[PDB]
Amino acid sequence: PRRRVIGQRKILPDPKFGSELLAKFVNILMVDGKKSTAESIVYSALETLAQRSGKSELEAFEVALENVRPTVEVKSRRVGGSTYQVPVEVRPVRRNALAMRWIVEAARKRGDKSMALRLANELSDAAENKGTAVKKREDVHRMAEANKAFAHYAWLSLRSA
Amino acid sequence: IKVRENEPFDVALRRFKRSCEKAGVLAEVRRREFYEKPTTERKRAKASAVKRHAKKLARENARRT
Amino acid sequence: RKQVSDGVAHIHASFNNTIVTITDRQGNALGWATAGGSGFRGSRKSTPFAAQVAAERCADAVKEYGIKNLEVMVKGPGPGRESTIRALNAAGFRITNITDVTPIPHNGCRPPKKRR
Amino acid sequence: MKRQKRDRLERAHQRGYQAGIAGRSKEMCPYQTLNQRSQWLGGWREAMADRVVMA
Amino acid sequence: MQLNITGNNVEITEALREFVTAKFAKLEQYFDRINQVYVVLKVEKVTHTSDATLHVDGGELHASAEGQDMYAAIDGLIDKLARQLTKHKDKLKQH
RNA sequence: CUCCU
RNA sequence: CGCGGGGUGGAGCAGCCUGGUAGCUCGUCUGGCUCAUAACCAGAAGAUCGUCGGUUCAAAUCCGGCCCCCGCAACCA
RNA sequence: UUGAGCCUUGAUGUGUAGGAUAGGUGGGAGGCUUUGAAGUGUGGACGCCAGUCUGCAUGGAGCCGACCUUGAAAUACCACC
RNA sequence: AGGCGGCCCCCUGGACGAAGACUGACGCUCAGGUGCGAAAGCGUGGGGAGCAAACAGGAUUAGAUACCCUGGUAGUCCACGCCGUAAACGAUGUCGACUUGGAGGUUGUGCCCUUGAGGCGUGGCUUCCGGAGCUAACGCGUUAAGUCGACCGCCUGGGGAGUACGGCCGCAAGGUUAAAACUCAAAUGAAUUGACGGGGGCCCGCACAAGCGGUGGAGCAUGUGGUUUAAUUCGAUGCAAC
């Protein structure tokens, strides 16, 4: 908004594992205001991600996540008649949430029988650098890196951190 | 313009004198003969000069800050 | 290929494009690269980044002439003109001197009337 | 409904930067207090260079 | 662009609907892609007035014209709408 | 872009 | 009526500059962008390489035969 | 200056497989070398960025073939090209 | 007055000031007349880089005989004639006298400690701000739009109209002089309060951006318009009726 760096509230961590990133991930596919069955989808998917990956579950999810987190993201701008996209760097809070949104959408596609099987296979190919969300990641990097020639005025991401 | 010197050199001096007199006369001469409005633009520029000087001079009284 | 030592790097830096012509001391050309031919097209030619990629794609394909040090002439009041010489400090060259060959007539011919 | 963003200090910066880029070579539309006028003019002079680098 | 005639105290005859529709179609073709148009005809004991609301991509735009015989009011409203459309059209061209 | 009283 | 050259996405053609895997613009299909069309950008399929043969490990590439073009001619029953 | 043709020569011919920038076919365990060896003072070509040619040593008297992988075995050596 | 910008030469006009000398009212204005008069244009002869009406093409657009882009001929240049108009403007005729100040510019000159780019005066031309006074106000304000004097030009509601007819000038384009019928009760100047702007500055809003879920496709419910009917009671209709 115009005003208000807003008084921000935190979230509850995940019960089964010591993670708030995982609780955010439950809140992403928590469709229709119903947390419990989304928790059953996430747990049911990390179990078969462990059996279909061998390694542990939290590192399985995080290694599967860092192959879809982005670095540069386009912002569409128009000046005059043109309307070109300008690469902004993603801030590392927006980064992993923007990854998990693509994982969850690419799991709502892809359709297998169950949602835990779809999301389990989608995280598996996210470890394999093979699935859909890595194609969307590489689309974002190809068009921001393709439109890389724009670093300008003041409407985005002041001096540094 | 012409910068040659020893090992810390090559950028600041040159973009200074280059940028000022270059961008001035090329950005001026790049089009618009005008024949008539250097007269108007110098008249407005210098009337704005005396109005800015007298305006700041009598604006040097107070501002209640 | 000629095994030249020093060169003169002319940079034509107009508004809509920058072209970079690396020549020798004599004044006859060795290799050139433009801000249009580096993949950038139309309005995107008119950026400093396309001038930087132009200076890269000239500074190699003049490797076979073996230039250690070069002068820099820059003609044109364009959006390149400084990123393209940062891209020649960074390209592995020794900059002897930098001049300005922007043609300033002691007003002669009449310019066009262009805008409304 | 919360409080003002970057309390005129580096908002005074980007007002002087936008006003610097879009012409306005007055440098005569600033604030009047010192801690905001200083970087309205700071953004103005940081915007003159960003006008030289582009059209 | 479909057009939606209604009338408060003005009995919309079939010859009245043919003319209004033709005028609106002609205006729509001339200035911009228009999605829907509502026409309201009011009579208040003297003033034959007309309202129109055009829903166009940019948004709503409205005009109103009082006349003498209903037909005159409609003509005024259509010219006003055309003028408004020119403003909206290159208001969202603005290259 | 930084040369005033 | 015999010499030459061509048969490769829908089309124009590279490849055959060296026998070892089929390539570029458009048209056609997405997606981003745009008020929508456009323009820009990023991806994708698009061929048993004109058909039969054979020449060696392996042929779009090399060689026969046929068909289709385009030129050069021979065109004085 | 420069084509084109003709000799005399001299280099070049990494798909896959892999000790390897092996061109084909045939013959084929004999030449290399102290006519002062592998490395490199050296200097290039090629360069399908990995290997081969030759210039001069200060060294100085050494190397492969059949025997490992291949449709193929070695510019180990020679002939015809 | 129009206007006149590299540098040098030749011919030539005017202004200014210091100190004197000289003539002795020789002065001011001026209808008619004569002269000069930007640019465009016209005639003759040259010249033609760049630019650039006309013109072609590409765009843009609903259309685009336009703005934008790519080209491009007259013209722009010179010599000699013509035209004689301009927002030819300071929208302020010329000449003369008088009437508080300030800050500057430029150009001479006098005195004194030039002893230091110093100080005090004095003429000319010029820029801005303001005093009384004036003005409808805006503003003008010793360079007046203040107070006066001499002479000239011009005005008498807006449109018709600086047009027609006639005269004069011009190669032409056209210039000058200059009506009337008709028609309206207004036209106008300056300033004010709003409103408006594809004017500016600042702040804010689910206004955009970042997202979540919808409507528009479907069936059904309910309301409205239309059509029907004997009646389909009446009202609510942009947002702010459905």
What secondary structure, in 3-state letters, does D19-49 show?
A: HHHCCCCCCCCCCCCHHHHHHHHHHHHHHHH
D41 CB closer than 7 A to any strand F atom: yes
As a whole number of angstroms, the distance between CA A20 and CA C43 comes to 45
Q: At what angle do helices A21-28 and A92-108 cross, to 10 degrees?
A: 40
Residues 6+ apart with CB under 8 A from C68: C5, C6, C93, C94
Q: C50 and chain A: CB distance < 8 Å anywhere?
A: yes
As a whole number of angstroms, the distance between CA A156 and CA A75 comes to 9
Residue positions counted in chain A: 161
CB contact at 8 A, A133 and A106: yes
Q: What is the dihedral of CA A94, A96, A102, A107, to 10 degrees?
A: -140
Interatomic distance D1 CA / I65 C1' (Å): 59
As a whole number of angstroms, the distance between CA B14 and CA A83 comes to 35
What Cα–Cα distance (Å) separates residue C91 from each residue in A73, C6, C47, C69, C70? 29, 15, 19, 11, 11
CB contact at 8 A, A8 and D6: no
Scanning residues 92 through 151 of protein chain A, those with a beta carbon under 7 Å from any atom of strand I turn out to be 98, 101
Residue E90 carries which side chain, given as an amino acid letter?
D
Other Cβ atoms closer than 10 A to A153 = 19
CB contact at 8 A, E69 and E35: no
Q: B20 and chain C: CB distance < 8 Å anywhere?
A: no
Residue C34 carries which side chain, given as an amino acid letter?
T
Q: For D52, which of B23, B63, B65 is closest by C-beta distance?
A: B23
Q: Looking only at Cα atoms, what is the longest distance across chain A?
A: 55
Resolution of the entry in angstroms: 3.0
**Cβ within 8 Å, pair A153-D3:** no
What Cα–Cα distance (Å) separates residue B29 from each residue in A83, B11, B37, B43, C108? 31, 26, 13, 19, 11
Other Cβ atoms closer than 10 A to A100 = 23
Q: How many CA atoms does the CB half-sphere of E68 hold within 13 Å?
A: 0
CB contact at 8 A, C111 and B13: no
Question: Which 3 state secondary structure label does DSSP give D2?
Answer: coil
Chain B partners within 8 Å of D30 (Cβ):
none
Other Cβ atoms closer than 10 A to C27 = 8
Output the DSSP codes for B2-64.
Answer: EE--SSS-SSHHHHHHIIIIIHHHHHHHTS---SSTTHHHHHHHHHHHHHHHHHHHHT-S---
As a whole number of angstroms, the distance between CA D32 and CA D19 comes to 16
Chain C partners within 8 Å of B25 (Cβ):
104
Residues 6+ apart with CB under 8 A from A159: none
Interatomic distance B50 CA / I141 C1' (Å): 20
What Cα–Cα distance (Å) separates residue C71 from each residue in C6, C11, E32? 8, 11, 58
Supply φ then ψ for residue C95, to 5 degrees: -85, 115
Contacts 24+ apart (CB under 8 A), A111-120: A114/A44, A115/A29, A115/A41, A115/A45, A116/A40, A116/A41, A116/A44, A116/A45, A116/A48, A117/A45, A117/A48, A119/A29, A119/A41, A119/A42, A119/A45, A120/A44, A120/A45, A120/A46, A120/A48, A120/A49, A120/A52
Give the strand pairing for E34-43 and E2-8.
Answer: parallel
Exposed / middle / buried, residue B22 (Cβ in 10 Å: 0-12, 13-18, 19+): buried
Strand partners, C71: C8
Looking at CA atoms only, how far is residue D14 from chain B in angstroms?
A: 24
Nearest nucleotide to E32 by CA–C1' distance?
A: I62
What Cα–Cα distance (Å) separates residue D48 from each residue in C4, C51, D13? 41, 21, 13
CB contact at 8 A, D13 and D31: no
As a whole number of angstroms, the distance between CA A142 and CA D48 comes to 32
Looking at CA atoms only, how far is residue A31 from chain D in angstroms?
A: 27
What kind and span of H or E run contains A158? none
Strand partners, C98: B3, C72
**First CA to last CA distance, chain A:** 21
Exposed / middle / buried, residue E89 (Cβ in 10 Å: 0-12, 13-18, 19+): middle
Closest CA to A87 of D44, C49, E95: C49
Chain A partners within 8 Å of C47 (Cβ):
149-150
Burial B45-60 (b: 16+ CB within 10 A, else e): eeeeeeeeeeeeeeee
As a whole number of angstroms, the distance between CA A89 and CA A98 comes to 13
Cα A51 from chain centroid?
23
Give the strand pairing for C18-24 and C29-34.
Answer: antiparallel
Interatomic distance A119 CA / I118 C1' (Å): 95
**Cβ within 8 Å, pair D55-C48:** no
Interatomic distance C64 CA / H73 C1' (Å): 39
Exposed / middle / buried, residue C61 (Cβ in 10 Å: 0-12, 13-18, 19+): middle
**Cβ within 8 Å, pair C46-D55:** yes
CB contact at 8 A, A38 and A23: no
Residue positions counted in chain D: 55
CB pairs under 8 A between C and D: 7
CB contact at 8 A, A121 and A115: no
Residues 6+ apart with CB under 8 A from E76: E50, E65, E66, E67
What Cα–Cα distance (Å) separates residue B19 from each residue in A154, A155, B26, C97, D53? 23, 26, 10, 17, 10
Chain C partners within 8 Å of B38 (Cβ):
none
As a whole number of angstroms, the distance between CA B1 and CA C14 comes to 17
Supply φ then ψ for residue C74, to 5 degrees: -130, 120
Closest chain D residue by Cα to residue B20: D52
Closest CA to A70 of A95, A101, A93, A107: A95
Other Cβ atoms closer than 10 A to A122 = 26
D27 CB closer than 7 A to any strand F atom: yes
In strand I, which positions have an atom below 7 A from any protein CB? Answer: 49-52, 60-62, 67-70, 127-129, 198, 200-213, 224-227, 236-239, 241
For residue D6, the 8-state DSSP code is: T
As a whole number of angstroms, the distance between CA E93 and CA E83 comes to 16
Nearest nucleotide to C113 by CA–C1' distance?
A: I51
In strand F, which positions have an atom below 7 A from any protein CB? Answer: 1-2, 5
Closest CA to E82 of E23, E2, E13, E20: E23
Interatomic distance B16 CA / I45 C1' (Å): 54
As a whole number of angstroms, the distance between CA A127 and CA A123 comes to 6
Q: What is the 3-state secondary structure (H, E, C) of chain C?
A: CCCCCEEEEEEEECCCCEEEEEEECCCCEEEEEECCCCCCCHHHHHCHHHHHHHHHHHHCCCHHHCCCEEEEEEECCCCCCCHHHHHHHCCCCEEEEEECCCCCCCCCCCCCCCCC
Whether there are 3 or more C-beta pairs closer than 8 Å between A and D is: yes
Supply φ then ψ for residue A79, to 5 degrees: -130, 125
Scanning residues 8 through 67 of protein chain A, those with a beta carbon under 7 Å from any atom of strand G turn out to be none
Residues 6+ apart with CB under 8 A from A32: none
What kind and span of H or E run contains E58? none
Residues 6+ apart with CB under 8 A from C60: C91
Residues 6+ apart with CB under 8 A from E27: E78, E81, E82, E85
**First CA to last CA distance, chain E:** 26
Residue C68 carries which side chain, given as an amino acid letter?
K
